[PDB]
């Protein structure tokens, strides 16, 4: 009966996704499922690897531009699509508080655990603001986001790059319909650059990205009673020149037979068979403008870091 419980209210979606992904001829698993407690902690670690420049690069821009962004938006409500990295969130909240504008915070995530942490953290640090955690998939459940106040919706970390172009276009269009006049969108997009720098960012020496990738198998093992042997799958990251995107795979070292008991499903991996677990699309600055335009959104500002590694867009 409680609004807070409705908003914070997945298991069905994982079942559907795992069945479809593992029974396809080209096997795949969606990257939205990487970020359980263990995966989120590993992502955290990823944000501090020397190879993985995106987080600190976008953080650098936000540290410099948050006050400008807040000034331009005039928003009183921060909506974050995909939570879990509060260092960036705090920068925008601080600026909104500085401006005497901050009334409300709405974190949005597919993982209920991540929402609780962010809600608790921001709740303790920002007195006198309304907090509504919204649990959902940003490809399906944007409607669950309350339509209140003037909302600055932020979608950082190049998470938009984890959508392929058709789903990405549908996401932007649905996002645009959810925004009301006066609302603003802040979008982070990692940029095309040296291909070796790109591959290494998803294939670090410390082996952390590999553990992060293999952890999706642990999620499925736990949630659906499967028996993936994690060490039997090799992490592989590749650049796709045609699509200008990183592609992340798990490759079976030897033939594998996997029983997914909760789905009453048995699946086979040939030796050398690869399963797609993520893409990370890299953008050209002029194209972000075009993709936003297609969705009916008008980019009003573009910022980049001092090295030009990463892009941040403000639109209405
Ligand atoms: N399809 C989806 N719907 C809702 N949340 C998603 C999602 N796919 C990934 N996420 C969430 O988004 C986060 C991505 S990693 C952290 C992103 C953070 N905003 C940053 O910039 O660093 C995770 O918490 C993950 O659970
Ligand atoms: N949004 C992040 C997510 C990510 C970082 N490292 C990964 C490794 C595998 C899959 C996804 C990721 C990115 O594409 O940069």
From Swiss-Prot:
Coiled-coil stretches, from where to where?
Answer: none
Q: What is this enzyme's catalytic activity, as reactions?
A: L-histidine + 3 S-adenosyl-L-methionine = hercynine + 3 S-adenosyl-L-homocysteine + 3 H(+)
List the Gene Ontology MF annotations in alphabetical order. Answer: L-histidine N(alpha)-methyltransferase activity; protein methyltransferase activity
Say what happens when this gene is deleted: Cells lacking this gene are unable to synthesize ergothioneine (ERG), but do not show growth defect. Deletion of egtD from wild-type M.smegmatis and a mycothiol (MSH)-deficient mutant does not affect their susceptibility to tested antibiotics. The ERG- and MSH-deficient double mutant is significantly more sensitive to peroxide than either of the single mutants lacking either ERG or MSH, suggesting that both thiols play a role in protecting M.smegmatis against oxidative stress and that ERG is able to partly compensate for the loss of MSH.
Query: Keyword set for this entry?
Result: Methyltransferase, S-adenosyl-L-methionine, Transferase
Q: Give the enzyme's EC designation.
A: 2.1.1.44
Q: Which residues bind S-adenosyl-L-methionine?
A: 82, 88, 109, 137-138
Q: Which GO terms describe its biological process?
A: ergothioneine biosynthesis from histidine via gamma-glutamyl-hercynylcysteine sulfoxide; methylation
Q: In which pathway does it act?
A: Amino-acid biosynthesis; ergothioneine biosynthesis
Specify whether Transferase is a keyword of the entry: yes
Binding partners and assembly? Monomer.
> Which protein family is named in the record?
Belongs to the methyltransferase superfamily. EgtD family.
Q: Which HAMAP family match?
A: EgtD
What is this protein's function per UniProt?
Catalyzes the SAM-dependent triple methylation of the alpha-amino group of histidine to form hercynine, a step in the biosynthesis pathway of ergothioneine. Among all the proteinogenic amino acids, only L-histidine is a substrate.
Domain writeup:
Consists of two distinct domains: a typical methyltransferase domain and a unique substrate binding domain.
Q: Know the name of this protein? A: Histidine N-alpha-methyltransferase
Q: Which organism is it from?
A: Mycolicibacterium smegmatis (strain ATCC 700084 / mc(2)155)
């Amino acid at each position: 009966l409680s609004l807070a419980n409705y908003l914070a209210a997945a298991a069905e979606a994982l079942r559907r996704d795992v069945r479809a992904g593992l029974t396809a001829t080209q096997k795949s698993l969606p990257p939205k499922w990487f970020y359980d407690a263990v995966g989120s902690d590993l992502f955290d670690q990823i944000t501090r690897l020397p190879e993985y420049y995106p987080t600190r690069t976008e953080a650098q821009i936000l540290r410099t531009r948050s006050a400008e962004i807040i000034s331009a938006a005039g928003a009183d409500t921060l909506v974050e699509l995909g939570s879990g990295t509060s260092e960036k969130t705090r920068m925008l909240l601080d600026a909104m508080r500085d401006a005497e504008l901050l009334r409300r915070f709405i974190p949005f995530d597919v993982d209920a655990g991540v929402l609780r942490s962010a809600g608790a953290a921001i709740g303790a640090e920002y007195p006198g603001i309304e907090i509504d955690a919204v649990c959902g998939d940003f490809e399906e459940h944007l409607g669950k986001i309350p339509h209140v106040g003037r909302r600055l919706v932020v979608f950082l970390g190049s998470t938009i790059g984890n959508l392929t172009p058709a789903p990405r276009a549908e996401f932007l269009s649905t996002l645009a319909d959810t925004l009301q006049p006066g609302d603003s969108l802040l979008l982070g997009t990692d940029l095309v650059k040296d291909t070796g720098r790109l591959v290494r960012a998803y294939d670090d020496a410390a082996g952390v990205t590999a553990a992060f990738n293999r952890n999706v198998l642990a999620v499925v093992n736990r949630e659906l009673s499967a028996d993936f042997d994690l060490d039997a799958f090799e992490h592989v990251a590749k650049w796709n020149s045609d699509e200008e995107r990183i592609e992340v795979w798990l490759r079976a070292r030897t033939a594998q037979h996997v029983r997914v008991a909760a789905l009453d499903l048995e699946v086979d991996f040939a030796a050398g068979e690869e399963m797609l677990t993520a893409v990370s699309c890299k953008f050209r600055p002029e194209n972000v403008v075009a993709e936003l335009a297609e969705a009916g959104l008008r980019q009003t500002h573009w910022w980049t870091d001092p090295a030009g590694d990463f892009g941040l867009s403000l639109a209405v």
